[PDB]
Structure formats: C-alpha cells, structure tokens
Scaffold this active site. Structure first.
Site, PDB file in Angstrom:
ATOM      1  N   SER A 143       0.796  -1.086   0.013  1.00  0.00           N
ATOM      2  CA  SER A 143       0.043  -0.193  -0.125  1.00  0.00           C
ATOM      3  C   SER A 143       0.939   1.201   0.038  1.00  0.00           C
ATOM      4  O   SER A 143       1.836   1.416  -0.771  1.00  0.00           O
ATOM      5  CB  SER A 143      -1.116  -0.143   1.080  1.00  0.00           C
ATOM      6  OG  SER A 143      -2.088   0.801   1.010  1.00  0.00           O
ATOM      7  N   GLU A 237     -10.192  -3.817  -6.565  1.00  0.00           N
ATOM      8  CA  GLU A 237      -9.183  -2.849  -5.803  1.00  0.00           C
ATOM      9  C   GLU A 237      -9.254  -1.502  -6.587  1.00  0.00           C
ATOM     10  O   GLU A 237      -9.047  -1.389  -7.669  1.00  0.00           O
ATOM     11  CB  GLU A 237      -7.750  -3.108  -5.681  1.00  0.00           C
ATOM     12  CG  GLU A 237      -7.403  -4.139  -4.871  1.00  0.00           C
ATOM     13  CD  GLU A 237      -6.026  -3.951  -4.132  1.00  0.00           C
ATOM     14  OE1 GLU A 237      -5.617  -3.078  -3.538  1.00  0.00           O
ATOM     15  OE2 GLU A 237      -4.967  -4.823  -4.475  1.00  0.00           O
ATOM     16  N   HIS A 267      -7.556  -5.140  -1.279  1.00  0.00           N
ATOM     17  CA  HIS A 267      -6.250  -4.710  -1.053  1.00  0.00           C
ATOM     18  C   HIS A 267      -5.577  -5.405   0.116  1.00  0.00           C
ATOM     19  O   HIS A 267      -5.862  -5.796   1.300  1.00  0.00           O
ATOM     20  CB  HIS A 267      -6.677  -3.209  -0.531  1.00  0.00           C
ATOM     21  CG  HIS A 267      -5.707  -2.282  -0.131  1.00  0.00           C
ATOM     22  ND1 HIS A 267      -4.798  -2.061  -1.398  1.00  0.00           N
ATOM     23  CD2 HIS A 267      -5.204  -1.824   0.875  1.00  0.00           C
ATOM     24  CE1 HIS A 267      -3.699  -1.154  -1.076  1.00  0.00           C
ATOM     25  NE2 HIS A 267      -4.251  -0.949   0.393  1.00  0.00           N
TER      26      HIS A 267
END
Length: 295
Positions: A143, A237, A267
């Site tokens: 991320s 996502e 995610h």
C-alpha cells in the site's frame, strides 16, 4: 475466489479501518485487527535502532541470516506500525527464507513527507553500514509502503547507493490524487480503499506539497535503473490502476517488472493469509520471486 474471501470482505465492510473519525482511532483500529492473526511461537523479534530509525528484526527458524528484506508497512503514510505488520513480515521471512527488518518510519500528520523516505533510505544505508550486501537484499512494502518502496529505490539510486537485488510492491499506492480509472470503476467491489480516505491521508502526508511530488507519488518519479520488481495487486481494488500505471512506467524505463493481478482479490489480501488461501499463495510467490533473484 475462495469462499474465505467473503469472510474477509465482511470483516472489512464492518470495520471500515480507513474511515475511523480520528487518526488515533484509525491507528488503534488497525492494531486491534492485526491482533486477530495468531503470531507463531517460532518467530523471533529483536528491537533495533536502525541508524536512527526504530526497527525490529523478524527471524524465523529457516531464515538465511545473510539475506534481508527491508519491509515498509502500509497505512496511508499515517497508520500502521511494527505491531500491525509483524505478521506479514514473518510470513515473508518464512517464504523467502530470510530475515526481515521491519522499520517504524515516521508517520504523518506529525511527520509529513519526506520524513518516511528519509527514514527508509537511512535504514537501508544502515543495513549496508552494518554489513549486509545488496545482492542479498530486497525492499518490500504494501500500500503506502509499496509506494515508499519505489520512492526509496529512486532516492537510493540518485544518491549513488548500490541498489538491492529486487523489490516487491503489494497493492502499491503511487497516485496521491486518486485519478486512476479503477478509483471509480472498482469503488463498488473494494471493501477497504476509496478515494475520500486516500485524499484524507494524502493531505496529511503532503502538507500542501504538490501531490505529484515524485518521491511522494512515484508514478511521477524517474524509474530508470531500478532492480527487478514484483507488483502484486488484486482486481477488486480501487488501487488496481496504481499498479498498472506503475508497471507501465517502470517497463518504459527499462525495469524488469512482473505485474501479477490476482483475480477478485482485495487490498493487501496477503495480510489475511491466516484465513485466506490466496493470501498465503501470494506470499509463497513473493518468497519464490525473492529467492530467484538471490540465486
């Protein structure tokens, strides 16, 4: 996808970790969720001062002591910690048969960009100073930490520092404006990430800086000379197109990229590997990729 995916989706749709009303509640909420994953008794965690950045070494029984991943946790540059990501770190250590240095890089809003990149680069340089060899190293992150991985490589390269053997990005966040197509088209299927929370965190990290600042948003960075990259991303996502655009940019710059889109995954699904088969499968693939680049 496995029926287990539904359980994870249901967890995320209720907890809404990126939608908590305050930064501290977001931080605490993610810590509470991470506590749910059973951390194995065979994991050894050793706190260290990684050249002015707090860290923890994460070792498992089959860790080759000379192979090291510098792991950069997710959390929007705002949340996450050694506690939230120690389980993902140990899983990677186990699959890649290496040690992981999991760093507590400075977080926003308290410490805006470029603090996180200063810390990641400092930790990498400290690894070199203390005897690790680039050919046995890698940088990885999820991320925000996946974006940070790319930025760290860029900054290291630009400073003439020898780059590691490979790098790994798990659902990287590289577009701080949320203008990828999937930010709209995958909004319905993404139980974790939406544009509003991303912009909220981006504001904290940027502190008024241009959202296309290359070391903050490495979609706009010069990627030439980076080592082999693995980008794992799920198709469910809003951040899908961050990975697609990153792969495009990296390949255009001559980097050896492997873009792996996992159908229907959410995610950082890898973090749910205790219960989600695809999460453990993806981690096994990370280990395979790293070991290959360390041969």
């Amino acid at each position: 996808a496995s029926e287990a995916l539904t359980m994870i989706v249901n967890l995320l749709r209720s907890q809404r970790p990126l939608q908590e009303p305050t930064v501290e509640q977001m931080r605490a909420g993610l810590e509470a969720m991470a506590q749910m994953s059973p951390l194995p008794a065979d994991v050894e965690l050793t706190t260290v001062d990684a050249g002015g950045v707090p860290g923890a070494w994460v070792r498992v029984p089959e860790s080759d002591p000379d192979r090291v991943v510098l792991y950069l946790h997710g959390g929007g540059y705002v949340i996450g910690s050694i506690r939230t990501h120690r389980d993902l770190a140990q899983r990677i250590a186990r699959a890649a048969r290496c040690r992981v240095l999991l760093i507590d890089y400075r977080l926003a809003p308290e410490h805006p960009h470029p603090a996180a990149v200063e810390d990641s680069t400092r930790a990498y340089r400290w690894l070199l100073e203390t005897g690790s060899d680039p050919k046995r190293m890698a940088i990885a992150g999820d991320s925000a930490g996946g974006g940070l991985t790319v930025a760290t490589l860029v900054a290291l390269r630009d400073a003439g520092v020898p780059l590691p053997a490979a790098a790994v990005c798990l659902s990287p966040w590289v577009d701080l404006e949320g203008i990828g197509e999937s930010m709209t088209t995958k909004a319905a299927v993404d139980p974790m990430v939406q544009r509003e929370p991303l912009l909220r965190m981006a504001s904290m990290y940027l502190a008024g800086q241009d959202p296309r600042t290359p070391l903050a948003a490495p979609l706009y960075a010069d990627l030439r000379g980076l080592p082999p990259l693995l980008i794992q991303v799920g198709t469910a996502e809003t951040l899908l197109d961050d990975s697609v655009r990153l792969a495009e940019r990296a390949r255009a710059a001559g980097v050896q990229v492997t873009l792996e889109p996992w159908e229907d995954m959410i995610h950082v699904w890898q973090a749910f590997a205790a219960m989600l088969p695809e999460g453990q499968q993806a981690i096994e693939r990370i280990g395979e990729f790293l070991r290959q680049h360390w041969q």
